[PDB]
Amino acid sequence: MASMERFLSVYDEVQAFLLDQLQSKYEIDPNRARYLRIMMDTTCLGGKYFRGMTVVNVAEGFLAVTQHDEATKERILHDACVGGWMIEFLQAHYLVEDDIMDGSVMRRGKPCWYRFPGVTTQCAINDGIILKSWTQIMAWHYFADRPFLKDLLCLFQKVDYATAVGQMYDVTSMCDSNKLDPEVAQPMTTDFAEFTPAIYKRIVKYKTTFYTYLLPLVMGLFVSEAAASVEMNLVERVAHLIGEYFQVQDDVMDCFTPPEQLGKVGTDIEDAKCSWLAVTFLGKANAAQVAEFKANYGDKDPAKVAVVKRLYSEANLQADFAAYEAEVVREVESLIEQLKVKSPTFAESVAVVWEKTHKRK
């Protein structure tokens, strides 16, 4: 789409600005510049640009209905593209660090960044850190005299902390809460008692939904000077809901979508993750199924990993996913209807977000 190439063109302005500032102010040599260019490209490009392109979609919505000089339209769009790139760079940061914490092997149809031969965990940890400072450098440079700067930085902060807290819920999702202890090596749960819908929901709310839906949506609002034109409690509710669905889909695909289709390789079963599959399976399994699940979950072993998949397929989780999906369609449509009271344009941007999410892979 033309609009996605126009987005990428702003990626090139930003890359150019960051790398020139490295040379002019940070005493960098061409070879490290080159390494940081390739790192930026590898970690930030080749996704679908969903987060970034949402910020742009929202802004366009308000421009269709709003009186502006042409130079104001151009600036709003550019600000939305820049804000889009903050969020894509924030994602890049999270995926680089996440792939380390998950012992992942592939991302966007390539090796995880830290697995590149000339990278390694040593460098990629820091590269992940650079990725997020860049989001701040962008904000302070591009949005220096913007009315929304302070509101934006503060929202960005808050989304980032929630996501890190959520990551903590995720990485410890396989241990018994009463057993967490810096001093003692953590055992994997044997009862699976904390694999419940409530616990799963909390994990997903934090680790995924703030940065993937709340941020892009409210960002689109901020660059638009349009936050007073929506019910922010509704933005939060619908972002948290669509974001949960997004993760459930992510959980399903980890187990059931071919790696050549997915672009990554699934590790949830081996990582013992609290995925939607695991929770739902335990929500409907009989006594014997639970025992066989417990014997196999959370082991690298191919005969074990494979057994968990047959336990999943045979428990007819498409039924459960279909009823889950149907309830979310209900509730998202409703939240949409509700946002139309104040903001027909925003509600429509939300319909598009929902539709693009609902039919992905």
Ligand X SMILES: CCCCCCCNCC(P(=O)(O)O)P(=O)(O)O
Q: Contact region for Na ion (CB under 5 A) — 189-197, 286-294, 336-344, 348-356? A: 189-197
Query: Binding of Na ion at residue 296 (CB under 5 A)?
Result: no
Residue 94 contact, options Na ion, ligand X, Mg ion, none, Cβ 5-8 Å cut-off depending on partner type:
ligand X
Tokens 């979508």 — which residue? 257
Segment contacting ligand X by CB under 6 A, of 148-156, 164-172, 296-304, 344-352: 164-172
145 binds, among Na ion, a second copy, Mg ion, none (CB under 5 to 8 A by kind): none
Give the Cα separation of 300 and 5 in Å (integer). Answer: 41
Give the per-residue contact string, 225-264, with a second copy (x = CB under 8 A; - = no). ----------------------------------------
Interacting residue with ligand X among 207, 279, 305, 353 (CB under 6 A):
207
By CB under 8 A, residue 164 contacts a second copy: yes
3-state secondary structure of 180: coil
| Binding of residue 102 to Mg ion (CB under 5 A) | yes
Structure tokens, 143: 């949005």
Q: Shortest distance, CB of residue 341 to Mg ion, whole angstroms? A: 35
Given candidates 88, 244, 250, 270, which one binds ligand X under the rule CB under 6 A?
A: 250
Work out whether 23 is an interface residue with a second copy (CB under 8 A): no
> Can you tell me the distance from the alpha carbon of 271 to that of 357, in angstroms, rounded to the nearest whole number?
26
User: How far apart are the C-alpha atoms of 41 and 92, rounded to whole Å?
Assistant: 10
CA 20 from chain centre, in angstroms, equals: 29
Choosing from 189, 296, 345, 349, the residue that interacts with Na ion (CB under 5 A) is 189
β-bridge mates for residue 110, sequence order = 107
Residues from 65 through 94 that contact ligand X (CB under 6 A): 94
User: From the CB of 153, what's the least distance to a second copy, in Å?
Assistant: 7
Which candidate, 313, 295, 93, places its Cα nearest to that of 211?
93
Smallest distance from Na ion to CB 289, Å: 18
Dihedral angle, C-alpha 163, 135, 46, 236, nearest 10 °: 40
Compute the Cα dihedral for 305, 308, 313, 319 and give only its sign: negative
- Distance (Å, rounded) from C-alpha 127 to C-alpha 149? 26
Position 98 contacts Mg ion (CB under 5 A): yes
Helices (H) and strands (E) in the chain, counts: 16, 2
Query: Does 29 carry a binding-site annotation?
Result: no
Q: How far is the CB of 101 from ligand X (least distance, A)?
A: 7
Stretch that binds a second copy, among 179-187, 246-254, 311-319, 332-340 (CB under 8 A): 179-187
Distance CA 135, CA 85 (A): 8
Q: Does 191 bind Na ion (CB under 5 A)?
A: yes
Q: Centre a 10 Å sphere on the Cβ of residue 232 and count the other Cβ atoms it contains.
A: 11
Q: Cα-Cα-Cα-Cα dihedral of 26, 30, 34, 39, to 10°?
A: -20
Residue corresponding to tokens 């996913």: 321
The Cα–Cα gap between 160 and 155 comes to: 9
Among residues 67, 190, 233, 286, the one that binds Na ion under rule CB under 5 A: 190
Residue of 135, 167, 343, 349 interacting with ligand X (CB under 6 A): 167
Name which of residues 185 to 214 contact a second copy (CB under 8 A).
Answer: 185-186, 202, 205-206
Distant-in-sequence, close-in-space partners of 63: CB < 8 Å, separation ≥ 6: 73, 76, 77, 224
Any contact of residue 268 with a second copy (CB under 8 A)? no
Task: Write out the residues near Na ion by the rule CB under 5 A.
Answer: 176, 189-191
Task: Write out the residues near ligand X by the rule CB under 6 A.
Answer: 94, 97-98, 102, 126, 129, 163-164, 167, 170, 207, 250
Task: Write out the residues near a second copy by the rule CB under 8 A.
Answer: 22, 26-29, 31-32, 34-36, 38-39, 42, 97, 100-101, 116-119, 121-123, 125-127, 129-130, 133-134, 136-137, 140, 150, 153-154, 157, 160-162, 164-165, 167-169, 171-172, 177-178, 180-186, 202, 205-206
